[PDB]
């Protein structure tokens, strides 16, 4: 559901990374494929060589959407209804992989804005991602 505080913290840490979608998104993706290789299975059609244009383009899109969700952090479902169709009905993404991607994302923020990721935010971000991942597969809820 996300409390007021949780919303505030999420917005905060996103203010610090805004203006880096392209760069960070590409990084979290590459860390995901590198540490959770089986996730590759979902992108046969992707150029997976480090720093590929595809990964960059997609990376940017991914975080662009997470950002979009923050602007409408009050109706994440509505905000991403079109994407839950895609990830649930169409691709049938295993809910387990959403964990891998959120994990890598936190790793990326930790490396570039370690001060921005205080333990309090860390918890708010974690509830945000489980919420997001829920909705994105949630068709089953």
């Amino acid at each position: 559901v996300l409390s007021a505080a949780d919303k505030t913290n999420v917005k905060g840490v996103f203010s610090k990374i805004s203006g880096h979608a392209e760069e960070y998104g590409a990084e979290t993706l590459e860390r995901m494929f590198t540490a959770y290789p089986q996730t590759k299975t979902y992108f046969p059609h992707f150029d997976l060589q480090h720093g590929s244009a595809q990964i960059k383009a997609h990376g940017k899109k991914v975080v662009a959407a997470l950002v979009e969700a923050v602007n409408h952090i009050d109706d994440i479902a509505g905000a991403l209804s079109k994407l839950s169709d895609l990830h649930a009905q169409k691709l049938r993404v295993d809910p387990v992989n959403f964990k891998f991607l959120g994990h890598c994302f936190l790793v990326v923020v930790a490396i570039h804005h370690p001060s921005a990721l205080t333990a309090e935010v860390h918890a708010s971000l974690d509830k945000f991602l489980c919420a997001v991942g829920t909705v994105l597969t949630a068709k089953y809820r």
């Binding site: 540490a35 790793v107 333990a119």
Partner: protein, 146 residues
């Protein structure tokens, strides 16, 4: 498990830099803060009333480093973790009855902590190597339930 020669390299090098004191504290803290229910196993640590009330708790900080230096024995002989943690699995399994799911949880936080302390020196390959370590350790701790 099988460890590539670099995986070992990647691991032992970073190990030498690690300040088990700061990292260990930072980690156990974050676990308690993000996944509240874990607090139950640490009732003996007094106040855990608030996030900030947790960073400070010296028992948390103390145990934090204790937990982290255990990995020191892991890095010790990456081909013998099972036997070196059997006694560790025994209490976590037969005694405390921690659900293996939390081992995974802690391992994940641990990774994030390292990433914040070594910034760009924590390369994707490096992350993967620790991910593996962290999991092969938890599998050694779990096991005792099967």
């Amino acid at each position: 498990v099988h460890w590539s020669a670099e995986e070992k390299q990647l691991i032992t090098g970073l190990w030498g830099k690690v300040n088990v004191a700061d990292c260990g504290a930072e980690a156990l803290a974050r676990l308690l803060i993000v996944y509240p229910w874990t607090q139950r196993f640490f009732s003996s640590f007094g106040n855990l009333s608030s996030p900030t009330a947790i960073l400070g708790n010296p028992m948390v900080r103390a145990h934090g480093k204790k937990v982290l230096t255990s990995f020191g024995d892991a890095v010790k002989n990456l081909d013998n973790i099972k036997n070196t943690f059997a006694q560790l699995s025994e209490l976590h399994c037969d005694k405390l009855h921690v659900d293996p799911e939390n081992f995974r949880l802690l391992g994940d936080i641990l990774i994030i902590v390292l990433a914040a302390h070594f910034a760009k020196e924590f390369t994707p390959d490096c992350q993967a190597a620790w991910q593996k370590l962290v999991r092969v350790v938890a599998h050694a701790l779990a096991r005792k339930y099967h």
